[PDB]
Each structure stands twice: as structure tokens, then as C-alpha cells.
Amino acid sequence: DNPFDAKAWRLVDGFDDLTDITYHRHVDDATVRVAFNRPEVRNAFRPHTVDELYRVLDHARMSPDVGVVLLTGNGPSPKDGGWAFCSGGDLHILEVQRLIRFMPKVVICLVNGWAAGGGHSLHVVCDLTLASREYARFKQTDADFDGGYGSAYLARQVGQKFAREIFFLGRTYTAEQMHQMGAVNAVAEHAELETVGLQWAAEINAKSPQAQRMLKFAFNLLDDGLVGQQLFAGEATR
Amino acid sequence: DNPFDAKAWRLVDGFDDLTDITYHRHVDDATVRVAFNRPEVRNAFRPHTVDELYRVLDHARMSPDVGVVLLTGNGPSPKDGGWAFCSGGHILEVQRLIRFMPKVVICLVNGWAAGGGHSLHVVCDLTLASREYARFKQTDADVGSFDGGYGSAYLARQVGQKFAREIFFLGRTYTAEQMHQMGAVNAVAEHAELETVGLQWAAEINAKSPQAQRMLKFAFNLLDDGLVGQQLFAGEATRL
Amino acid sequence: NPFDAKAWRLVDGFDDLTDITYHRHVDDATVRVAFNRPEVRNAFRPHTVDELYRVLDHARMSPDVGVVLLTGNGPSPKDGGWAFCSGGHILEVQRLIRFMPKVVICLVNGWAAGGGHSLHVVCDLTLASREYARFKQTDADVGSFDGGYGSAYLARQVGQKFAREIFFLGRTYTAEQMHQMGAVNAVAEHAELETVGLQWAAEINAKSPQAQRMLKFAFNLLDDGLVGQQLFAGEATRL
Amino acid sequence: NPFDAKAWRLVDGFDDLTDITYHRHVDDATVRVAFNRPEVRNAFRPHTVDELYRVLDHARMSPDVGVVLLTGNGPSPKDGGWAFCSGGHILEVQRLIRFMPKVVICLVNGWAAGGGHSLHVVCDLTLASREYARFKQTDADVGSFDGGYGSAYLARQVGQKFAREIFFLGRTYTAEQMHQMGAVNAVAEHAELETVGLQWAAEINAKSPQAQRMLKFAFNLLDDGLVGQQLFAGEATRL
Amino acid sequence: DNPFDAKAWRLVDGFDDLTDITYHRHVDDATVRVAFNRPEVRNAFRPHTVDELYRVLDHARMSPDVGVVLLTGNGPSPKDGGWAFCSGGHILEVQRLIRFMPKVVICLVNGWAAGGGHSLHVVCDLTLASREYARFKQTDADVGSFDGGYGSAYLARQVGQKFAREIFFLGRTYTAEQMHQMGAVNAVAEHAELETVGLQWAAEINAKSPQAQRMLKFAFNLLDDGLVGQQLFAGEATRL
Amino acid sequence: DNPFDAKAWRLVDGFDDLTDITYHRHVDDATVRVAFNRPEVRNAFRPHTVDELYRVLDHARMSPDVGVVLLTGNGPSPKDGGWAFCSGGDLHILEVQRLIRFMPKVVICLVNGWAAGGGHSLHVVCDLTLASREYARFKQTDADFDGGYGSAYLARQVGQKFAREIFFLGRTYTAEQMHQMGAVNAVAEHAELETVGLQWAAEINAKSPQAQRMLKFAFNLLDDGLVGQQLFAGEATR
Ligand SMILES: O=S(=O)(O)CCCN1CCN(CCO)CC1
Ligand SMILES: O=S(=O)(O)CCCN1CCN(CCO)CC1
């Protein structure tokens, strides 16, 4: 029961050299799948991982025919059978966060397992998050810090009380709990996570691309100040 | 089982010419009922509808003895028995009128709330919805159009950035209960009682210091309206 | 009772307090600050605010204290009821709570109305008694109103729709309802409120103090503008 | 005189105006809206505000008008003095000026005090008579005060230090001094004020109208929060 | 030619123990004079100095009959004849006290205003400076230290982003006239008259409605203090 | 009397292929010189120009030993002897603006001549601007639009009245006029522009680098919302 359905994806030309990240383009949809490929180490990212992740996402950003990015983690671990989206630290990861934030495409994080530390922050900055009911685990390790989108932005999803709780105590939360607080859009059966992700991607791609771009930047504008204004006005310039 | 109770309302004088909107004043309370009156077309609004809506709301804004505005849709559809609050297409001006008026505007979603109709509910101070028939759907995106202001950004100040983005990006249909869970709907009520509950909420609001209610609304607006918000709040302070 | 005397010690220099009690945990870097006027539902009078400010300020300057538990003593000797704070310079207490480099957890053991409700809102976290926590924003029907952290900030917790509801109608809500809306972190059984509070305090204190301070100001920075930047930048200036 | 009758035509539907004059340029997409109560230094009474609102609103809806010149007629028949507006719903006029998709240029031909000063502040641009422009923020000594666009927004033009000076002391300033601080775009000889205003209006109207609208809301967006976003986004929705 | 006029001031009762700060009340006006009293060291402040400064300012904040605070430095240096307002090193708390107090704080820069001393001038509501001896220099950067709050960011709200960045990045020394041109100094005055001019400004401020002045200050602060700014302004409104 | 003093600069290894941009590293200082190299066309930038400019600036951003970036235009025009920093449009230029905005180094724009359209916007987003007294010409062409840093940010330098004027009328301004309004830090003799630029760079580099980084982000934080918070908090994380 692996979330990954190989038949639905094709490798993107120009990335045979990837080792820490897998990059696929859907066989029919204007959707790509970017995933951490280090299950043995719970998909923790090392400097090299960040470089590939940035390269891949930047390429997706510039792909005219791609309207949705599915960001997830491959699994399970061959070592213990566990599941992880991204366990965090082992080009800065902050640049990856901004790339996700600023790209004119909807980025959906598919939390298939542990999402801790920097991995948790990556999920927070994504536009939407779908999570495995059985294996998704949310834990902000930091304080055990990310004073940017990792934290402050979480408050714009679950509220100041819950956000402070998540960070100050660093407890572990399930997909359902995070859904109740407002940080997870929907909970899905583990085996169905990616299938549900592709359904959401399809509904998004079925609408006006220009409208989707404008909307994303309109939502960003609320908290990104001048940068947010630049991107929205930039798209207004057509 | 219709939400409207004829015995509780009286038409406002001076609006006999309204065709797309009904405007009533409660027989006893400082509350008015503004409703879309085109059930035959799922209360979609045409340019003429917006003009009447603006006129009516503007009149309510200036009515010294009115403290609460109930915004809803008349129903059901004469030709399908369906319910609708407003199914969408100056409207931006209507949004600001609702936003800036020193009175609490409660949207009573009795049916479909789509497109511009959905945005109207979002900008209202409070929203109550019909459990059985309220239906929320942000259709702008799949219409090529979009509201990058109070309709969208402000929704995020109600349900959070994740849910707001979902609502707009996918344009799915949600029930009163779902929208209530996300935080965009204050409470769910039986369809037949939507207005009865609305009047009870209006009564509780009107039972308090009007000056305090005005100050509070502008205090809540100030958080996101920047200088405009400051002007309205400080405006009240200067008055004091 | 919520209170477990065996776990607290009085703080030297405060036996002159009459409206507030101030304790230091026997082991944890945590203090307990509580309203001490149960006979009148822990409402605060000018004298109460002075003691509260003094106590909180002292806690703010205590280097070995990382968490402040703010609650109300009970029950009322007059009716057996429970109250955290029933309401009425209190604005200065709010800022003290907001700006202090320590996590302030409000433990709502009973009624939290008016200014009492506003105090809970400004605290970093809130835990509430399932059986006795009662939330009610009274001001409006009294002609008064808190247009600062009491109201605006509540919206940053439960959203604009619910926040406006809470203030405009002034209804009473349970711990559970408030938890559902997002202003209450967790609900606890009355007798366990403080025990749960100490467990949360322990988890907080078990982490890097510098990190916790930085995080609190990072969360404040989102809404405190220049003041928020000053505190975050200042905290960074240390490192 | 500042006014050149040969260049303006009355606007149909406004011969009932008494406190305001409303003209349309014979050639340019520009209108002239002016206070018409020189005998009392163009101070505004409730009736004046109504006409002003009506006129500005009409200008706002005129598709072929890209620039609004806001000034005051003169001189005073009683003392030969000059005034733009001496002060006292006026808040609604401010928003109309702020939100209309047209560039509003205030031409200060004389005294600009109290509400009159606030009107100049909220306009997009200000040109002033070197010999007669007099800026004075009176409110404070009257017990009154404009805590919105009149004050806060002035700070976005001359900076926090100068803005506080202007309001706290309520001193009178010349066109030159105000230009030096940043609230006045340019100083002009009295007789040339309107001629210069039309030249600026012409340069504005010679460019893409859609671009000018977008730019105005882009500048507003910096300080008008959600309202500013609504207007910019709405303007974009067109394209 | 000393700025201070003994005949115009009277010591405040209860502060005989001050060593690093002087605190006077004007003989007739609702104005106080708070000054750094360590000329021998270019009025640099040590921890003890900050404690006294905070105490003094806090007392002024609570003085109902005081509407204006004049913040300056005593001089000249006993051992070099040089002038200094404050040459720099809890101070953040002093900044907020100046920022939040419902009274106008005018900084009179009589000499060197460097490091923390420069930041104090920036946070004051108004600044008047000695033409001959005022010297502005943000030395933090070349000290390895920095003020990323009111000392820096807020300076940008006075001189604009370009000039503010220049002042901090290069740490050059500027005169009263230069700082006035950039917008951080309200007016330049003859050294010997700095305080005389300061009292004239204080008199004009005090001649107006105290309530209005309080409201205005908080209205100006609201622009950049977010929720804190709202709390203080709304605070006054509730009072009303 | 050319502002460029060849003896003081060395080409940066790895950029012999540049055609629209020149990239030098000072012989002694931790300062680089990035300049538009299309004088014949008044240094207008074409898509290829933006690509090189971005590559160069990104490399400067990642150079540990570089603390200051001098951004200017080479000249004069071999066609008419005129001077230009950048005349504007002929990887998006918006990405270049953000790169300048976000890099932890002080970027000084040396306006040696015409600064129009996108060229003017580039000067506005730079941390500091020094301009040639005889040849600097500021003109916002757009409306004849940049609703981001190009415009809104200008208002944070010269005030709302002047900013609106500059954009609505699109008039041409001198170094001195722009200096009076607050958008130009200092005016310098044309032949001395770069020498003065190196002096400013030296004073900046003479201070604590960590302090300079913190300060720049503290100034940005005022208007960059969450993005600004992310960068400042990111540097706070050390
Ligand atoms: O709008 S704010 O980002 O300032 C605060 C968000 C408030 N809410 C957070 C979480 N829930 C999510 C839906 O239950 C509701 C409101
Ligand atoms: O602080 S703001 O960015 O909102 C407005 C800037 C105000 N000023 C602009 C230009 N001058 C520059 C110095 O003369 C002074 C103040």
C-alpha cells in the first residue's frame, strides 16, 4: 500500500543526476511530483538535498505547462519501514521556502509521514496540505528556531494560540489534529494520499491559470508586504 | 417552512420601486431585512440589482434607529423550488458600504452563496446559515474572474490561509456545517428558523451600547484596513 | 482543588500582598500568579492591578523563571463558585504579559469576563477547566470596550467572524466551545487544571530558553509592528 | 487671477450649487472643483460638504475626466484675502478623493487650515501659491483632531518628525517651507497656480489612463491595507 | 553662552539621590527638563544611568500637570570644554517609555548624539539641535552592536529609506543642518538658545488641548506600532 | 573623464562569456562592480541582459569575501557620447530586484547617466544611490507600470506626494533634485562617481559584517512583511 503509483508518472528530462530528490511529470496532467528521496534517513535534507530541491522546484516554476506542484516524501524506510515526508535538517532552505511562496503555481504538500523541523516548516509554507491519516506526524523540533514562515506564517493558519503551542512545546500531532487546528486541508487514507493529491491538482488545473496566479498572490499580499505587492502588481501588469 | 415571517416585518417607506431587492424594517426591533429578490434566477445580481442593493444598504446606514442589518435571499425558486442567498453576477462599492457602516451586518445564507454572492457573505460582520440548504461555493476561479480583496484575502482572516486558499483554488461546494468548522460561518440554524435566529442575534446586539458596538466594529476592522481603518476608528474617537 | 500547595513556595518580598498570591514552584522554573479575591469572583480593583503589575514585573525579571501560570484562586467562600477574573492601568499589565521574555499560560479555572477575559486573550497560551471555565466578553452592555488586545488580538486567534460574535453579542462560552474556536489551547478537568499547566510549563522549560524567547517575539512581530521589531531585534542583539 | 474663465465650462446639472463651483476644461480631460465661500475664507458648513461630495462623486464617475483640480475661489470680497479652505461627513469626502481612479491635485491658493489642511493632505498632489498659500493645522487648540488621513497620512509625506511638529504646535507655514518638508509638490506664482495646475493635469492625461489608475492604487496599497488591496485587485480584475 | 538657564528651573522633589541625571520642573510651565549629567564622559550612559533615566521619565509620565518633556545633555565637558547630548553606552525600556507616554518628548541635542544617544533622539517625538555643536553619528555598526528597532527602522520613517540606510551603514557624522535637511531634526537653533527655543516649543504645545495632544501622538504612533499602537489609541478612546 | 578606473579592478573568474554585463572585483576591497555593458543602446536590457545580471548578482551574493556591490552602467555611448546607467527594457527583472533586496550585502547604485523605466526601478530598490551631477537623469517612463518596489518603495524614500509626482507625470530629474527629494544619497562629480562609490564601500566594509547584514534586514523588515521577518529571523538564527 504505497502512496506512489509509478504508472502515472514520467521522469523529467534533464534530471538523471538527482540522488536526494525524485522529479516526475504526470502522464496527462499539468502536475509535477517533487519528493525527498532519502527514506533510509527519514528524508532528512543535507546541503546537497537543498540544492537539488531548489533546482527541481525552480525548473517546475519555469515550466509553462505545469500548474500544480505536489511536494512529498518517498517511502517507506528500508531500514525500519517507517514513513517520512521530511524530518528536517541533517543554497539555504529559506530560499526554497521563498521559491515555493513566490512561484505562480499552487504547491500542495502531501505529508505521507514525519514532518519535523525544517520538514514541518516546508509543509507550513506550501499553499495547501493533504496528510496521511495513519502515518502523518507533525512536530516542530526547532526549540528542542524558524522565526519566519516556519512559525509566524503558521499563526496565519491555526491562530496565535495554537501556533505558539505547536512551537513552545514541540509536541507531535496527527493529520486529524492538525486538520482541526487549520494547518491541514484534508486527511486521506495513506494509500490514497497521492491519488487524492492528483484529484485536487486536477480541480485546480481545470480553472483559469491566470486567475489561479492572481489569487495566490492576492492571498500572499496580506502578509508579504512590498514583496507581496510586487508579485501581485507584477501579474497585474499581465 | 419558509424562513420569512410576514407578521414580523414592514416595508420601508420610499422603496415601492424596488424590483430586485426587498427592504423591510422589523415591527419592533431596530433591525432591517435586505434581501435579494430574484429567486427565479437563484438571486443572481445584474447591474440594476447592485444599484438597488447599494441604495437600500446606504439608506440603512443612515437610519439612526437601525442598529442591525440582516442580509439574505428570498426563496424558494418559483420554478425549481431551490434555495439561494445569491449566486453572483459597483459591487465593490457595496462591499465597502457593508464594511464601513457603523452597524452590524449579519448575512443569513438561506441557500446557494456562489461567486459574488459568496464574497458578500465573507465581508459581512457575521454569518448564520441554513443547515439544510446553505451552499458555499467560490466559483470565480472557474469563471475566469476573481475577487482579490474582501472576497478572498479577508476570507483568510476568518478560516486561515490554508482553508481560504483551498476554498478559492478548487472552488468546491461546502455545507453550513463545514464552513462553520472552518470559521467562516458563526452558527448553523434550521432553515425554517434562520431568520428567527437572525432576529435573536440582532436583538442581543441591539440590547447593548450602540456607541460601543460602533467602536468595536471599527476596532476589528482597523486590524486589516490600514489607514482607512484608522480614519473610521479615529473618526469615532474625535466624535467622542 | 486545582491548587497543590505541596508544589509551591511563597516568593520572598511579597507577604504584603492582599489581592494576589505569588508562588514559585518547588522544582520547576515556573511561577503561579493568581487573583486572590474569590469572595467577589476575583474582580480587580485599582489596588489589585498594582499588585498584579508588581508581581508580573518581578517574574519578568527573574532569570531562573521561564514560565508564568496566571490563574485565579477559589472557590468563592460566599457561594462556592469559581472564577479566574471577573473584570474591573490594566493596559500596562497587558503589555507586561505581551512583552516579557517568558511564556505566560493562563489557567481559566472559572469565570473569565470583561477585563478578566481580555487578560486570558493576551496570554500566550490558555488552558481551561472543563466544568467551570466560563468565557464572556461583557464590556459592550456596560458601555465600555477593549479595542486593543482584548478584541483585535482575539481575532488573530479565532478569526474575524468568531471574534466579532464574541464581542457583539457578549454570550457565555464553555472551555470546549472556546477551544473549538481557537482561543483555548486545551481543556482539562478542573482538579487537574494546574497539574496540566505544570506539565505544559515543564515541556516549555525543557527547551532552549533563548529559543523560546526568540519564538515568542517572532510570533508577536506579526502584529506588534515597530514595538514587535524592537523586542525581536533586541533579543537578537544578545546572541 | 488664478482663474481663467476662458478655459472652463460649467458642468450640466449643477447650477443649483451655492458653496462650490464645478467646471470642465474646454479641451483637457480635467475638472475644476472649488470652494465658493470667499467672504468667509472658504470654510465649509454641512451644506458645503454635501455639494462637495456630490461634485467629486460626479467627477469620479465621469469616464472622460482623468484629473480633478481642487482649489478655492477668491479673493474674499470682505478683506481681499485668499483662502483654499479654512475648515469647518467630511471623512466621506476624504475617502472619495482617496478611492477615485483619477489623480486629484489640490491647488492651495490661500489659507489651508483645519479640515481644509486635511483635504490638501489626502489629495494625490499639491501645488501652492507662493505668495498666498498658508498651511496651518488648527484642530488641537480647538480641542478637536483628525487622527486619520489628516495626520497619520501627513507623516507618509513629510516624515514622523515634521508631521508631529505640524500638528502638535499648529504653526503656520508657507508654500516653500511645506515644499521643503515634502507635502507640497511645487510652488507657483499666485497668478499662475491654475495655469501650472492645468499643465500638470495635461502631462498626467497624456499617459495611459489604465496605467495611472493602477499606479494610484499601487501607492494607496502601501497604507490602505485590505481596502487598498480591494481597489488595486479590482482595477486589475478589469484588464 | 550655556544653554541652561538656572533662573528658569526648579529641582523636582524626591530626586536628591540622582547622580547621572538631573531632573527639573519649569518655574511656570508644565514642562520638565531631563538631562544626562556626565559631561566629563560625553554623557555616556552606564547601567546606573539608565535606571535613573527610566525612573525620572516614568515619574514625568505620571505627573498630571506635566505636558512636555525636554530631554537633553548637560555641558560642557569639565575636562575638554566639549559638548555632548549623549554618546551612548534596559535602554530599550526607556525607548518604549518615551514612545508610549501621553506627553510630547522633545530631544534637545546640545552636542554629540552617538550610538544609544542617537537612538534616543530618534525615538523622541521632536528634535531641536544646536547649530554649532550638535553632532549626529550612529556608531553602533562600527561597534559590532546595533539597534534594529526604534533606533534604526523608525529613523527611516523620518528621513526615508535611502538616508536612514546611509546613516547606519556608513556611520558618518552629520551636523544639525544636514540632519534637518534629511528630516530627522525639526529645527536648528543657536547653541545658547537651544533650551530657550525648546521652552517656546513646549509652551505652544501646552497651550493646546491636552486630550487632543495625547490622541494625536497615539494616532501618529498607530501607523507603525501595530497592535500596541492600537491598544494605546483605543485606550484613550475608551476613556473618552 | 570616464568614471571607470580600470587599474582598480579585476575580472571575476568564470565570466568571460558575459556580453551585456561586466563583472569586476576590486583589487583590494571586498567590493564588486556590476555594470550594464550596452552603451550603444543606452544600456537598455534585453532578456539576455537580465539573465547575465541575475547570474552575476547571484554570484556576488554568494561571495563570502564581498560586502558591497556597486551597480552602475558603462559609458559613454560610442554612438552619441551620451551617458546611461540603464534606460530600461529593450528570468524576469523582478527576480533581479528581489535578489538585490534580499542579499546580505549593501548594494549601491551609481547612476552615471540616464536611469529610466526599469533602469530607474533598479536604482530605487538599491540600498543606496550616488549620482553623477552632470549626467544623471531620472525618469520614470512606465505610464508613458511598476506597482512594486519600483513605485511603492520610492514612496518610502521621498514621501507619497513626491513619489506620485515622479510616476504620474514622468518628468526628468537631475541628481540634485532627486537628492533634495530623498531618493539620491549624494551627488558626485561625474569623473569621481566611482571613486566616491569605493569610498562609501570602504566605510561600509570597515564595520562589522554581521551588524551590516542585521541592519539591512532590519530596514527591510519595515516593509517586507513576513518575507522581511524571515530574512531577519534567519540572520538572528546566526
Ligand atoms: O486571520 S488570522 O491569520 O490572523 C488568524 C486565523 C484565525 N483562525 C485560525 C484557525 N482556525 C481555522 C479554521 O478552524 C480559524 C480561525
Ligand atoms: O516614512 S515614510 O516612508 O512613510 C515617508 C517618508 C517621509 N519623507 C520622505 C522624504 N524626505 C527625505 C528627507 O528630506 C523626508 C521624509
Could you say which ligand is closest to the alpha carbon of residue B186?
1
Does residue D239 belong to the interface with chain A, where contact is any CB pair within 8 Å?
yes
Q: Cα(C159) to centroid of ligand 1, in Å?
A: 5
Q: Which helix (H) or strand (E) holds D127?
A: strand D125-129
* Atom 4 of ligand 2, nearest CA residue: D156
Question: Number of C-alpha atoms within 13 angstroms, CB side, residue E131?
Answer: 7
* Atom 14 of ligand 2, nearest CA residue: E182
What lies within 8 Å, CB to CB, of F28 at 6+ separation is none
Q: Cα(A160) to centroid of ligand 1, in Å?
A: 8
Residue D193, C-alpha cell as written in the block: 497656480
Alpha-carbon distances of E48 from B15, E124, E145, rounded to whole Å: 73, 21, 20
Coil vs helix vs strand at B84:
strand
Q: Cα(F155) to centroid of ligand 2, in Å?
A: 8
Residue from A15, A218, A190, A53 nearest A112 by CA = A190
Q: In whole angstroms, what is the distance from residue C233 CA to residue C227 CA?
A: 10
Alpha-carbon distances of B2 from B38, B133, B166, C154, D65, rounded to whole Å: 16, 12, 32, 36, 49
What lies within 8 Å, CB to CB, of E84 at 6+ separation is E36, E39, E42, E43, E73, E75, E77, E110, E111, E112, E117
**B215 neighbourhood in chain E, CB within 8 Å:** 234, 237-238
Rounded to 5 degrees, what angle do the CA atoms E223, E226, E227 make? 135
Q: In whole angstroms, what is the distance from residue B135 CA to residue B117 CA?
A: 11
Q: How far is C233 from chain B (nearest CA, A)?
A: 23
Q: Which helix (H) or strand (E) holds C69?
A: strand C67-72
Does residue E46 belong to the interface with chain F, where contact is any CB pair within 8 Å?
no
Q: How far is C55 from chain B (nearest CA, A)?
A: 30
Q: What are the beta bridge partners of residue B68?
A: B31, B104
Yes or no: say if C101 and C213 are a contact pair by the CB < 8 Å rule: yes
Yes or no: say if B233 and B222 are a contact pair by the CB < 8 Å rule: yes
Q: How far is C148 from chain E (nearest CA, A)?
A: 4
In order of their start, the domains of chain B are 5-206 (3.90.226.10), 207-240 (1.10.12.10)
Yes or no: say if F32 and F68 are a contact pair by the CB < 8 Å rule: yes
Chain centroid offset of residue F202 CA = 17
Q: In whole angstroms, what is the distance from residue D32 CA to residue D10 CA?
A: 10
Q: In whole angstroms, what is the distance from residue E215 CA to residue E235 CA?
A: 10
D138 a known binding residue?
yes
Q: In whole angstroms, what is the distance from residue D58 CA to residue F149 CA?
A: 33
Q: In whole angstroms, what is the distance from residue F52 CA to residue A194 CA?
A: 39
Alpha-carbon distances of D222 from D219, E157, F215, rounded to whole Å: 6, 13, 22
Alpha-carbon distances of B118 from A148, B111, B224, C138, rounded to whole Å: 32, 11, 20, 32
Residue from E70, E48, E87, E205 nearest E124 by CA = E70
What lies within 8 Å, CB to CB, of A90 at 6+ separation is A41, A44, A45, A46, A49
Does residue D163 belong to the interface with chain F, where contact is any CB pair within 8 Å?
no
Sheet of strand A172-173, all strands in order from the earlier edge strand to the far edge: A84-86, A114-116, A137-139, A172-173
What lies within 8 Å, CB to CB, of C63 at 6+ separation is none
Q: What are the beta bridge partners of residue F10?
A: F25
Nearest neighbour of D204 by CB, restricted to F161, F169, F223: F169
B139 a known binding residue?
yes
**E217 neighbourhood in chain D, CB within 8 Å:** 164, 168
Q: Which residue has the cell 528500508?
A: A78
- Does the beta carbon of E157 lie inside 6 Å of ligand 2? yes
Yes or no: say if E95 and E150 are a contact pair by the CB < 8 Å rule: yes
Yes or no: say if E74 and E104 are a contact pair by the CB < 8 Å rule: no
Q: Which helix (H) or strand (E) holds D25?
A: strand D20-25
Residue from C165, D84, D160, B88 nearest E186 by CA = D160
Q: In whole angstroms, what is the distance from residue C229 CA to residue E225 CA?
A: 9
Nearest neighbour of C156 by CB, restricted to A147, A160, A223: A160
* Atom 3 of ligand 2, nearest CA residue: F156
Q: Cα(A158) to centroid of ligand 1, in Å?
A: 5
Amino acid identity for residue D95 in this structure: R
Amino acid identity for residue D125 in this structure: L
Could you say which ligand is closest to the alpha carbon of residue F223?
2
Residue from E67, D224, E140, F227 nearest B99 by CA = D224
D34 a known binding residue?
no
Q: How many helices (H) and strands (E) does chain B have?
A: 8, 11
Provide the experimental method for this PDB entry: X-ray
Chains B and F touch (3+ CB pairs under 8 A): no
**C226 neighbourhood in chain E, CB within 8 Å:** 149-150, 153-154, 224-226
DSSP E74-136: ----TTT---EEE----HHHHHHHHHHSSSEEEEEE-SEEETHHHHHHHHSSEEEEETTT-EE
Residue A154, C-alpha cell as written in the block: 503558521
Within a 10 A sphere around the Cβ of C226, how many other Cβ atoms? 25
Residue from B225, D105, E160, D102 nearest F155 by CA = E160
**A223 neighbourhood in chain F, CB within 8 Å:** 225-226
Contact at CB, F223 and A223, closer than 8 angstroms: no
Q: Which ranges of chain E does DSSP label H, i.e. alpha helix?
A: 47-61, 91-100, 116-123, 153-159, 161-170, 176-182, 194-206, 210-222, 226-239
Yes or no: say if D67 and D105 are a contact pair by the CB < 8 Å rule: yes
Nearest neighbour of C222 by CB, restricted to A143, A152, A161: A152
D225 a known binding residue?
no
Yes or no: say if F233 and F44 are a contact pair by the CB < 8 Å rule: no
Q: In whole angstroms, what is the distance from residue D142 CA to residue E208 CA?
A: 8
Name the CA radius of gyration of chain E, rounded. 17
Q: Which residue of F has its CA nearest to A61?
A: F91
Residue E165, C-alpha cell as written in the block: 540606510
Q: Which ranges of D135-192 does DSSP label H, i.e. alpha helix?
A: 139-142, 152-169, 175-181
Coil vs helix vs strand at B87:
coil
State the SS3 of chain F: CCCCCHHHEEECCCCCCCCCEEEEEECCCCEEEEEECCHHHCCCECHHHHHHHHHHHHHHHCCCCCCEEEEEECCCCCCCCCCEEECCECCCHHHHHHHHHHCCCEEEEEECCEEECHHHHHHHHCCEEEEECCCCEEECCCCCCCCCCCCHHHHHHHCHHHHHHHHHHCCEECHHHHHHHCCCCEEECHHHHHHHHHHHHHHHHCCCHHHHHHHHHHHHHCCCHHHHHHHHHHHHCC
Contact at CB, C200 and A169, closer than 8 angstroms: yes
Coil vs helix vs strand at B1:
coil
**Partners of chain F (3+ Cβ pairs below 8 A):** A, C, D, E
Q: In whole angstroms, what is the distance from residue F94 CA to residue E68 CA?
A: 47
Q: Which residue of B has its CA nearest to C162?
A: B186
**Residue D108 phi, psi (nearest 5):** -85, 105
Could you say which ligand is closest to the alpha carbon of residue D163?
2
* Atom 10 of ligand 1, nearest CA residue: A158
**B185 neighbourhood in chain C, CB within 8 Å:** 161
Yes or no: say if F67 and F209 are a contact pair by the CB < 8 Å rule: yes
- Pocket residue to mutate for ligand 1, from B155, B159, B165, B224, most atoms within 8 A of Cβ: B159
Q: State which ligand 2 atom lies nearest to the alpha carbon of F156.
A: 3
Q: In whole angstroms, what is the distance from residue B144 CA to residue D237 CA?
A: 10
